[PDB]
Design a protein around this motif. Structure first.
Motif, PDB file in Angstrom:
ATOM      1  N   UNK A  23      29.822 115.491  61.924  1.00 22.47           N
ATOM      2  CA  UNK A  23      28.860 114.532  61.398  1.00 22.47           C
ATOM      3  C   UNK A  23      27.603 115.284  60.961  1.00 22.47           C
ATOM      4  N   UNK A  24      27.217 116.294  61.737  1.00 23.66           N
ATOM      5  CA  UNK A  24      26.031 117.089  61.418  1.00 23.66           C
ATOM      6  C   UNK A  24      26.278 117.852  60.110  1.00 23.66           C
ATOM      7  N   UNK A  25      27.486 118.383  59.956  1.00 31.74           N
ATOM      8  CA  UNK A  25      27.838 119.118  58.741  1.00 31.74           C
ATOM      9  C   UNK A  25      27.770 118.219  57.518  1.00 31.74           C
ATOM     10  N   UNK A  26      28.222 116.976  57.683  1.00 32.67           N
ATOM     11  CA  UNK A  26      28.208 116.001  56.606  1.00 32.67           C
ATOM     12  C   UNK A  26      26.769 115.709  56.182  1.00 32.67           C
ATOM     13  N   UNK A  27      25.904 115.494  57.167  1.00 29.36           N
ATOM     14  CA  UNK A  27      24.496 115.186  56.895  1.00 29.36           C
ATOM     15  C   UNK A  27      23.748 116.343  56.247  1.00 29.36           C
ATOM     16  N   UNK A  28      24.041 117.560  56.687  1.00 29.84           N
ATOM     17  CA  UNK A  28      23.385 118.747  56.158  1.00 29.84           C
ATOM     18  C   UNK A  28      23.902 119.163  54.786  1.00 29.84           C
ATOM     19  N   UNK A  29      25.216 119.076  54.598  1.00 32.99           N
ATOM     20  CA  UNK A  29      25.826 119.483  53.345  1.00 32.99           C
ATOM     21  C   UNK A  29      25.916 118.368  52.317  1.00 32.99           C
TER      22      UNK A  29
END
Ligand SMILES: [Cl-]
Ligand SMILES: [Cl-]
Ligand SMILES: [Zn+2]
Ligand SMILES: [Zn+2]
Lengths: 21, 29, 28, 21, 28, 21, 29, 21, 28, 29, 21, 21
Positions: free
Chosen positions: G13-19
């Motif tokens: 989820x963090x990767x989705x938000x950052x990328x």
């Protein structure tokens, strides 16, 4: 506080209402 | 409702569901 | 940290990610 | 508000930092 | 415990929060 | 159904309790 | 931004938000 | 790697940017 | 494993569930 | 598919994804 | 792309396996 | 049961299909 309590222990949805605006 | 064991984002999600439109303040302290 | 459409619980999750232990306020 | 800046429109994580305590 | 638009996984998450160990049924 | 009461329309957590086992 | 403690789906989820739109590769290794 | 690090230890959103396309 | 409308973070979550430690690529 | 380690809301989310429209019963017992 | 197959249209978990590494 | 198993141990998506309607 209640927040810490929810994680380390347990808490009720009622206690959480305390954080609502 | 049942008692809760909530940490991190799960607690924030619970706050969102309980407070909804009224919004809320997340203060871990 | 591209721009995105963040609504409801997804927005609160993003705030949690960004703010962490500092805490935050969600006021629509 | 945050909703108009991030949900209606789009916003960056840096703008989200504006809402930290 | 205001009223909200809960759909899909968000609704199941809400049911989980409210029902907990009691369990619940999700039947669209 | 739950979908018509909570997703189509809006509902309260108390109404959600109607679906617990 | 604060440092993170992320495991499982929370990391994704963090990767989705950052990328976001750019997408990303999740490689646990 | 950073992924493992985020879970066993801690990591920054900046380190996570490494995984973006 | 019915068919569903999976978008944004919900799609990434599904990929995580299906792929696990094998990892995956999310490329819109 | 890979084997899973799912607890709490994560298990419910998995049930939603696997069952989808068919719905499901969550019975922790 | 995955978005057109799973988000625009609908897809099965088996189709999701197409995107594993 | 399988539910408990998923958390204390591990489980497959196939075992979870058992809980679908
Ligand atoms: Cl959504
Ligand atoms: Cl967790
Ligand atoms: Zn959503
Ligand atoms: Zn979690």
């Amino acid at each position: 506080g209640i927040v810490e309590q929810c994680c380390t222990s347990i808490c009720s949805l009622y206690q959480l209402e305390n954080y609502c605006n | 409702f049942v008692n809760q064991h909530l940490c991190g984002s799960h607690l924030v999600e619970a706050l969102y569901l309980v407070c909804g439109e009224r919004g809320f303040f997340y203060t871990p302290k």
